[PDB]
Design a protein around this ligand. Sequence first.
Ligand SMILES: Nc1nc2c(ncn2[C@@H]2O[C@H](COP(=O)(O)OP(=O)(O)OP(=O)(O)O)[C@@H](O)[C@H]2O)c(=O)[nH]1
Lengths: 62, 135, 560, 341, 476, 54
Amino acid sequence: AKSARASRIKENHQRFKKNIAGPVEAARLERLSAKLMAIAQASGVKSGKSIGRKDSSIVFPM
Amino acid sequence: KRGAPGGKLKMTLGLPVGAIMNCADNSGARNLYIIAVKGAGARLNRLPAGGVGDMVMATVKKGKPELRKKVHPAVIVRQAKPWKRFDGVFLYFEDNAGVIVNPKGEMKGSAITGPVGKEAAELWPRIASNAGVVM
Amino acid sequence: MPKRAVSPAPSENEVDIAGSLFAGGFQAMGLDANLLRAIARKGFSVPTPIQRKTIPLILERRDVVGMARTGSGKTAAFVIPMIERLKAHSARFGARALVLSPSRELALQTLKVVKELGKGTDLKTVLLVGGDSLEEQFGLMATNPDIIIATPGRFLHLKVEMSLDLSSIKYVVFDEADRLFEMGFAAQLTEILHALPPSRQTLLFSATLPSSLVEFTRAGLQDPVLVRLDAETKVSPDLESAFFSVKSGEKEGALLHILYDIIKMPLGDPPKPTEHSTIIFTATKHHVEYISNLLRLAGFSVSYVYGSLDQTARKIQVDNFRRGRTNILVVTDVAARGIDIPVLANVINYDFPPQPKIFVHRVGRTARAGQRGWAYALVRESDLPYLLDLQLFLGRRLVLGREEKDPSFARDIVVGSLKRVELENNVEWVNKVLHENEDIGALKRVTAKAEKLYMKTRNPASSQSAKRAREVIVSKGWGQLHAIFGEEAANEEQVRDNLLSKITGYKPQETIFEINKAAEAVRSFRQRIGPRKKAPKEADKWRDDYEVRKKRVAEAKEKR
Amino acid sequence: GSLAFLPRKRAARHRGRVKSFPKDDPKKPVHLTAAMGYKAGMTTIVRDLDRPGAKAHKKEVVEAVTIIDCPPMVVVGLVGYIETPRGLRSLTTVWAEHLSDEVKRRFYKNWYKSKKKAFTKYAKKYAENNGASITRELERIKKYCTVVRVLAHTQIRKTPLKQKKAHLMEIQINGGSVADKVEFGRSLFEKPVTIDTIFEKDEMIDVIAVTKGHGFVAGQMGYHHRTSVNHKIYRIGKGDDEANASTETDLTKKKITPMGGFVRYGEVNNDYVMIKGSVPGVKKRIMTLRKSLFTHTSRKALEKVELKWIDTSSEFGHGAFQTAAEKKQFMGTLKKDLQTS
Amino acid sequence: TGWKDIPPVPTAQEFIDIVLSRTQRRLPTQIRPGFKISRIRAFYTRKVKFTQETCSEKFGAIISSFPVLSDQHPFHRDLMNILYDADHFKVALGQISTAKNLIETISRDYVRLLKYAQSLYQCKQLKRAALGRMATLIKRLKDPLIYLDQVRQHLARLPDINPTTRTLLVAGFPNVGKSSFVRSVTRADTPVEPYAFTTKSLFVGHLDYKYLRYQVIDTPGILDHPLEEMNTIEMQSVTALAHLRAAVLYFMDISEQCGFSLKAQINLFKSIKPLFANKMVFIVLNKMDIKKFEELDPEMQQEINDLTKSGEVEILRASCATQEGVQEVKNHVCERLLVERVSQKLKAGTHSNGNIGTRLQEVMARIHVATPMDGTTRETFIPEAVKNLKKYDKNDPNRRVLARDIEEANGGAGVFNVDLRKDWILENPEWKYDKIPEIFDGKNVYDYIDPDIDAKLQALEEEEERLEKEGFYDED
Amino acid sequence: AGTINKPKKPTSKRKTTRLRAKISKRAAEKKRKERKLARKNPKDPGIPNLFPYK
RNA sequence: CGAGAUUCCCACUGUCCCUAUCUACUAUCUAGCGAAACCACAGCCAAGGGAACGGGCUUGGCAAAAUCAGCGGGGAA
RNA sequence: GGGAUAACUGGCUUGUGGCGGCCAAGCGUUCAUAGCGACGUCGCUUUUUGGAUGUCGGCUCUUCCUAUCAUACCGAAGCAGAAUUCGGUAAGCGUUGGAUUGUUCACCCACUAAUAGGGAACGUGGACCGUCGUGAGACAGGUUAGUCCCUACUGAUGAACUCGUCGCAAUGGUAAUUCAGCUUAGUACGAGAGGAACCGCUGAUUCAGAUAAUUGGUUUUUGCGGUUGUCCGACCGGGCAGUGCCGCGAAGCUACCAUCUGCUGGAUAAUGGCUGAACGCCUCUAAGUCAGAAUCCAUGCCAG
Ligand SMILES: Nc1nc2c(ncn2[C@@H]2O[C@H](COP(=O)(O)OP(=O)(O)OP(=O)(O)O)[C@@H](O)[C@H]2O)c(=O)[nH]1
């Protein structure tokens, strides 16, 4: 019997992944993301748009 | 092809090697002696066990003088050990019974006495043909 | 799994008449009045030659080795003088007579003979066989019998368990010693021989004398006298013989041809032997089963008796044959020496015997009391050297094919080939059966493997037998028709086969490859071969037969 | 035993770590990768098999299925990870205001004797127009981070357990750009997420739990972190329907909970996931459901399931009465009930 | 069944290389001087014994597998003899036995020598010497291996006939048209190239004739030599003609286009006549289209009729080019062969005695036809539809849909899911694809299905109304 | 061969003093044996052609 | 209750295992009391260490306190 | 009785015999003839008809090697097909019996994909003192010789680094194996007999990790029902039979006696190629490069 890691079995599994389970999982995740979105919608420094500082074993002590 | 049934679901095998089961067909044998189960795996210290629908080597220890002490293949038809069926039904038989069969599938006898398992009947067509009671 | 699990159950029947190197009514033999009355009640009016020759020696107290077939009266032969010597029960503790037999059935037969021939006497006889209660055997030994009939293993086990003293035994009988040695009882037989006191009279009754048995008798018997069944080796002049050179692939068909035309056997169940009485002797039990099934398919009334067959089955088969419900009896060698075979009219040996003396026994199985008998042999190219050993042993002139117009089939060993047309038709039908029914094919394969093993395990022939076997194969008579097929046949086949003989004697000029390195090797090879110049369960209230079962339990408790 | 699972180690954490999430590509739409529930128990179902080429095709098949009580989970945080030559590392996390009492019990160990001060200054920072700092953290996550996880907690106060401490876990957001997934999480803050939202019907997943410790009769045997792969959700029940165990074949209005309630668990009133086969862990234990790392390679997945009924006889005994109605009807009237009436 | 299942045999150098490879690779190979002398001798004697065992098993397989010449049917023995000189084959397969036996003799000899060996170098040189003896023995056996390989190859590529079964041989001079006839009558490829000895080996085909198998054999051909001197091809031809119990057809042509005079065919056939006297023989005048049976000379006609005079010969006309009469001639000859076979089968079982064989009883039981004594025939139900529908033909383009084609379009064996709903027939079509309730409130809906249940419910409601009037639920 | 992915047992180049001493003694014995055989007992090439001034 | 009708088992062993019964042997913790053998100094592993001599030494692999329970490695004829 | 060696091997071991002749490049006493001298061939073993084994073992377990029985891969073969044989890449995987025997192998037969070989300090559980004899020996005469410590490892804990939550992953281990059935297909092939493979689908063996929905089993739940004998004069309730026995029995624990699950990318070896020099032809190789094994390396998994 061919091993579970055989090249032929891997190629057939990849073909199955790209041709059969692909669209099914795509539509599944599409409706899932749709329901996710349904539930979800259901001065620079002074405003915080500019990223600033909050609040060393890489460099030798100086 | 080696004498191993193809297309059989898992079940609780209840007939070990060396088992005295009673005979089913009208060949003349009174009992069959399970001595070797065809298709069993190779595990040390593990006694090969057989279930309904498996051809098992059998030896007539008690029977008509013509057929006594004779080794031929035989397939299990009835097992008293409880086994479950894919409809979720646990069932078991009164006795342990098998019908003498040649390695192709022609049964030496002509009529099968008593009931017959669905597993044996489905795996072997002529057992269904010459079996008068299958449940 | 159990296909030749241990060994072919019928191994061989080896005989050694070199054991010969060891050295008219009951009222005339003067037995006691009570013994004479018992014999008359049993119905023994005229003694058979075996006891006629042995009983005076046993009364003279000489050790005896008796070559006798089953059924000749060996049991009576060794029990009558034993009773005549005993004459009474002894008040002193200790057994006086011991008989050792292979199987419980033979032990029971001997026990019945002893009881019937000793009706009236106060002799205590015991049976010690396997399967009986050891406590019961202890009680019997406590009751102190004078005569013991037992199997070697059970007797040794009882002796070891009870520390029995055998010094009081003066009479020892070994029934079926060749069977004892074939079953392998030799070790405990020697142990019992060592345990027995030297001052004893030993009788050993056997149908065959193997070399191991001869050595055992030489080591354990004091000046044994060998008595034999008269002219058991002298081939009867009323025996007609024909031998057929047959190939393995056509050999079953040849057997069918002999059954159909040479004997003209009727087909079906027959409407004390019969007029035909066809017995066939083979090599292996697998051959026995194969030939039996093939012949019942062909339509014969066949009974088969092989070595390791169940006791009841073999009795039923032998009863059917002896009462004439079957016409063919298929046996190898072991069941043959075992069972009682009546007078036969046709004997055919499928597999040629290794030993000329085995052949002599198998052909003396027929043509008895002045009656004419027929014997047909199936001989192959590999079996020819044994046929040549046989012709040396018998001292008969060899007639190959049709070298003589009217050969004497009784005094001359006549070998020939069978008729080609019917041979081929039977071969075709055999092939059709083999292709059609799978059971026969499996039997063919297993009997072929058994025949291969028998070829490896068969005793070899002599160098000179192999030699003139080669020259016989070279000779023309090997392929010629048998003398039984007719002078008109001789005419047609002589008109034809001569150019066919030229065809068969073709020396090709060059092989088809000669017609590369392989071709060069073939040419050089050619130049090299260039010719040289129990209580019931407790009653349950809910159970229907509650009160009845309670009553049963109470009754069992009262019985205790 | 197998060398990949020895030496036998205790599970360091009772919850169970996810370790690996499915690989991310930007092309898919946004979605969470994980969810949590609690193993309530198992029942029996019979199914019209739709496996072509099988011996039992188009026949009644009886199977054992685990029930996982799955109350809605609450989003309380976002985290931003950065990819580094030393692996992924937590760059920065943002919390939510009005954090629940139960998630605070998770943050604490001795809750009864501690004055509730955790995250108070953080809520103050939200409240006092440090939205500058808030947007700074969110912009940092959007600009520098490649992987974002949503902190979500499951709610014992709805689960039927004597526990009162919530359960927290990080759940990756895949299928989109970093800005898109950060905006999605920001919307997600302070909103319950259902299992209808996270997972869906008749699909193959992976389940993480800690297999039971067989204690008190060469060492630790039991209590092992196990992620069993390839288990198929057949059903999602709603709680509020009250026809959850009800199937189209039998119009018997009952919940998934058999007669007398689940043994040693109780009775479930929430969303639940019914999955095929035996599943690691025991009752009352947290069960971590996640998506498969790879696209499936069998018809067992993308095989659509049609159910017949669910065993609702009392598992505390060998009962055979699915509903109290049919039981009280079949047994008739009893003397104690008659005297009460 | 044939002789193809014969294992290949190697050359001398090959067999040496593989045997020594086994004895090198399959056993332990390292030994040390510090080890015990007993273990050293055990090691070396194990090496010697393994070499003996592999050589013996290979030679035993070779001999026991090659065919045993003088146990086969005379056709087979003489055919393999003419192809391959039997005496020379036998002396080869001899040398190989004697060589193996000498191998075992050397084996015991060096086993005793190693058992009494006293040093590591002793065992060294003893093992080397023994293996050298076997190597030299095979080196001398170099040529028999080549010869036996060649005979193995041909005996594998040898046609397998059944001498017993119904057979029809086609013989004659070369170029008459034997190969053309056999290609016409059966599906066997025989070179039809027009030169003298086109076929150098026997060719075999098969046909069916009212549900019965016949085997046709084409033989190469025979010239005017008086069988004392022959080519091997003509010898295998005559051996087939002499040992194959079968119908015999002798193909001759009126036109001397084959290159032999009509008198030459007549002399050849009278020469081979005794070989065919027992049989049924059929002379076939081929190429009648180019040269018919009428126009040749009257004394030629007279001599061929004098040949016809005998009672086991027959004359037929044929033209294999246009297949004018091949069907008729094969039908007729095989019919007479079948009749003769039936006669022989009847005699086998009708043999003198008065009791019929069990097989014959069975064949009467089979052939017996049962018929009711009343002589009435039951009326039958055959519908006009299946009377006038069209026969099912696979090549036909305008075809039915077929479940197989639906399956292949929608997947395969394990892919396509069959739908019984399309096959459902119902009064209201949209009834289909609807779930059917089975259990409800713990009682079986199917078990409680019953027509007129409306009327029964009305009766029950009347009964309950009577009970309510009776006050059948009041408390006192 | 798969020596690249699965290396085998290394052959040590660290010579042992015992082996070195044995080699030295045996080579000395070889020199003595050559001398013994030589004592036991029992053509100019010319100027090269390619030389320019031969 | 039916002479009611029909089906299964019973053997021995100088053979192995289990279960049943008899005799004998077996028991933990905390307090209190409390020895002896033995002890040049201490014990990670690999290769080398001429003299089948390693725990010293050389070159490396490395190397993190302290307990309880299992476990395996060393100590001429 | 004296003398001598304390003892063996340690780049040892394997697959191809020896003796003689012929031939033989070279070297040699001075030159192929003082002579040495490989590969081959010839003559002998060796040709004209087809049982050996003494003490031992027996089982299990770990690890390792390959000199590979099978699984995977290819090169060759009258290899039509099927079934095969030889060769090599390959140690991930697995590698069962009976007969027979003192006992092993050979051979023999039964399963089975297959029953391959080995290593692990050959891995863990008597001789004189004599006395009586010298054509050979004996001696119930003696002297008598004769062994509980350390630590690695694992699990569970663990001091300080303020406590707690959520994480990262260096490192170490690493797991899946084989067979079967449907379709292809009674097709390709084939005179017949017979008779494939790819794709796709469904099962089964072994191993591994789990679980008790359902089915057997177990009852200090001593739960419910029954029941034996005893004594306390009797009721009573008790001691009673180191928990009396018999039926059913929950929960729990279980079961090769039940159910579930076991996963994907890259680089390679034999080999097959592309382009094209060495070498004006040619070439898979030298530069560059493609595919390719159950191989290797990582993900998936476990520890942290
Ligand atoms: N015109 C005609 N020619 C025929 C006929 N039969 C055979 N032939 C000729 O035969 C030639 C080929 O020889 P085959 O058919 O093989 O005859 P053969 O008897 O088998 O002899 P070989 O050729 O040696 O095999 C063809 O070229 C034809 O010309 C026929 O019926 N009519």
